[PDB]
Design a protein around this ligand. Structure first.
Ligand SMILES: [Zn+2]
Ligand SMILES: [Zn+2]
Ligand SMILES: [Zn+2]
Ligand SMILES: [Zn+2]
Ligand SMILES: [Zn+2]
Ligand SMILES: [Zn+2]
Ligand SMILES: [Zn+2]
Ligand SMILES: [Zn+2]
Ligand SMILES: [Zn+2]
Ligand SMILES: [Zn+2]
Lengths: 356, 356
């Protein structure tokens, strides 16, 4: 019942101090909505941080288009900038607006990672959906773009979803989300964070079922278990058949609205949550790290899974089941299909990524 | 932010079904206050359980003395009966009223465990305080009574305290509470319980610091590490010097007021928490178990620590530090100075206590 500012959450996760993503660019893919910038300047000023430069990029005709909807479209865009910008104010923000279609989504991503002028080193994605609700073509194309981004030295972060292990499908089975299920994507799960003064009192799996949402996570049907996830104790799917797949998510962060983020949407202060708040949070972390290293970390997943356990805060309590019946999936020691490796400890992650 | 009835909590901890403590007597030591019985009958009727017989016993002149104080005295007595009686309605309740003195406290306990007519098999105690704030005489006498109770085949349960690892002492050090620190007492810690339909979604260490209370627990200065606690990974005290002592607590249960118990105090419904809610809860469990076994379990501590781990729900997340600075003490795998062995799983505990 205590709400945080991004700075509070960042201190709890121990983000590298004295860094603000200066000289880095963060791309945000938006499939609808827009941001009113006076509401941004108002937000950054009340936080005591310099307002980061934010530029709009039109994809396939789409534009920065807010109109003051009570909830919905505007909530998506303003959120990412406010959360990531409060933590990486030195970073440049390129927001790519595209039509809400797979063509629009693909084009915004291909445009971003090939942007000659803006040159994003980080790409944050929120829009998700069940992997099997994607056509086989769109999956292949979108997965190719991510592989393209990895070879380009670009980090891509995606939310895992806010509908538990079932993922919003009622067929009676479990479904992970896409693009989160892609192995070329840093998948971000959700947790409930209790922190009081730069330290984590307790952190558990986010699960406000059977109504108010839960972190996505599980085992992919489409994508096989990657080589870097072999020593991760990833279980076979809970669905009948139960063969190995890609484990979702990779990381997790504060996503519970009850312990949510204090933001300003459409001129008015409020508190929000969800895994779509996590991807910008960790995008700022990556930006900060890129500043120190002097080069983009790029594709991170293989490296993350071979780092010492002390680099992360292992979440071991809670489950993904929104119904709380079968309790699938369950968090535990090490990697789990609710929170992945857990929440990152910024300074330790930075230390582990520095040259020997 | 969801409150429970005792029945809800009992289902989560999986209390043995088809048992209600019939033919058992539970003693409750009260050092002040009283209960208005119309408020009791009203409470048990709204729960759909038969109202258990409750008898008052005067010790050293003290009597069942409520007067309708907004908070305080009456809250202690009505609580224990309502929580324990809702779960063991078949049990007889002997409430021993004594003056708020060590003489009164000792006499109420010696009277209870030697009661020729009422014959309690279980004794629930709430009143606690820092072990070193007790005189050496009172400690020795009170500890002797507990040893007497154990040889008499009586189970004694005590709350661990609601002031974290410091225990309410400001000297800059950590203190466990007494009688909880006695090895002849079943010490009950506090947790925050999230359960939704007979299953535990998540359970963590109760800690509403730096203001609203936290579960007591730690390492005793007075009492040495018992033989039955040797294979329990009990750490040496956090205080300077740091020698071995008795580990507090032994068990833990729902004690967070935010996830508290729906009760009726002074005619009006409300929600309460604290470790003083835990001892009556587990006293009902013991009563239910005694019914099935056909004899009192009596001194339980040695048996508990040599039972399989699957009998308990291990709490592994959270800390005892009300300030959340040093984070002492911290919960983890197995026994810890915040929650002990964890919350009991009634059916598994009953199975483990049944003859081979
Ligand atoms: Zn390319
Ligand atoms: Zn399906
Ligand atoms: Zn929640
Ligand atoms: Zn658990
Ligand atoms: Zn884990
Ligand atoms: Zn005796
Ligand atoms: Zn002291
Ligand atoms: Zn609490
Ligand atoms: Zn933890
Ligand atoms: Zn434990």
């Amino acid at each position: 019942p205590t709400a945080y500012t991004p700075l509070d959450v960042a201190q709890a996760y121990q983000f590298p101090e004295g860094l603000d993503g200066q000289g880095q660019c963060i791309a945000i893919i938006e499939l609808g909505g827009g941001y009113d910038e006076a509401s941004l300047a108002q937000y950054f000023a009340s936080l005591g941080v310099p307002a980061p430069q934010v530029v709009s990029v039109s994809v396939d005709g789409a534009s920065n288009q807010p109109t003051g909807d009570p909830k919905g479209p505007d909530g998506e865009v303003e959120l990412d900038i406010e959360v990531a910008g409060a933590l990486a104010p030195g970073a440049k923000f390129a927001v790519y607006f595209a039509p809400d279609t797979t063509a629009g989504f693909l084009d915004a991503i291909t445009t971003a990672i090939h942007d000659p002028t803006l040159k994003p080193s980080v790409v944050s994605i929120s829009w998700s959906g069940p992997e099997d609700s994607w056509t086989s073509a769109a999956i292949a194309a979108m997965n190719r773009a991510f592989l393209d981004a990895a070879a380009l030295g670009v980090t891509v972060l995606a939310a895992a979803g806010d509908s538990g292990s079932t993922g919003g499908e009622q067929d009676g089975l479990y479904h992970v989300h896409f693009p989160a299920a892609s192995p070329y994507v840093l998948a971000c799960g959700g947790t409930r964070l209790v922190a009081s003064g730069g330290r984590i009192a307790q952190e558990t799996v986010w699960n406000d079922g059977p109504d108010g949402g839960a972190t996505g996570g599980g085992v992919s049907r489409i994508f096989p278990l990657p080589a870097w996830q072999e020593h991760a104790n990833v279980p076979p799917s809970a669905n009948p058949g139960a063969s190995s797949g890609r484990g979702v998510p990779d990381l997790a962060g504060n996503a519970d609205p009850a312990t949510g983020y204090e933001v300003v949407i459409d001129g008015e202060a409020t508190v929000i949550g969800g895994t779509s708040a996590v991807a910008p949070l960790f995008a700022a972390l990556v930006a900060r790290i890129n500043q120190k290293l002097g080069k983009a970390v790029g594709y991170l997943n293989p490296t993350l899974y071979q780092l010492p356990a002390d680099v992360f805060h292992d979440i071991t309590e809670g489950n993904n089941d929104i119904a709380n019946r079968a309790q699938i999936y369950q968090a535990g020691p090490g990697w789990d299909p609710c929170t992945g490796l857990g929440s990152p400890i910024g300074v330790r992650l930075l230390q582990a990524l520095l040259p020997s």
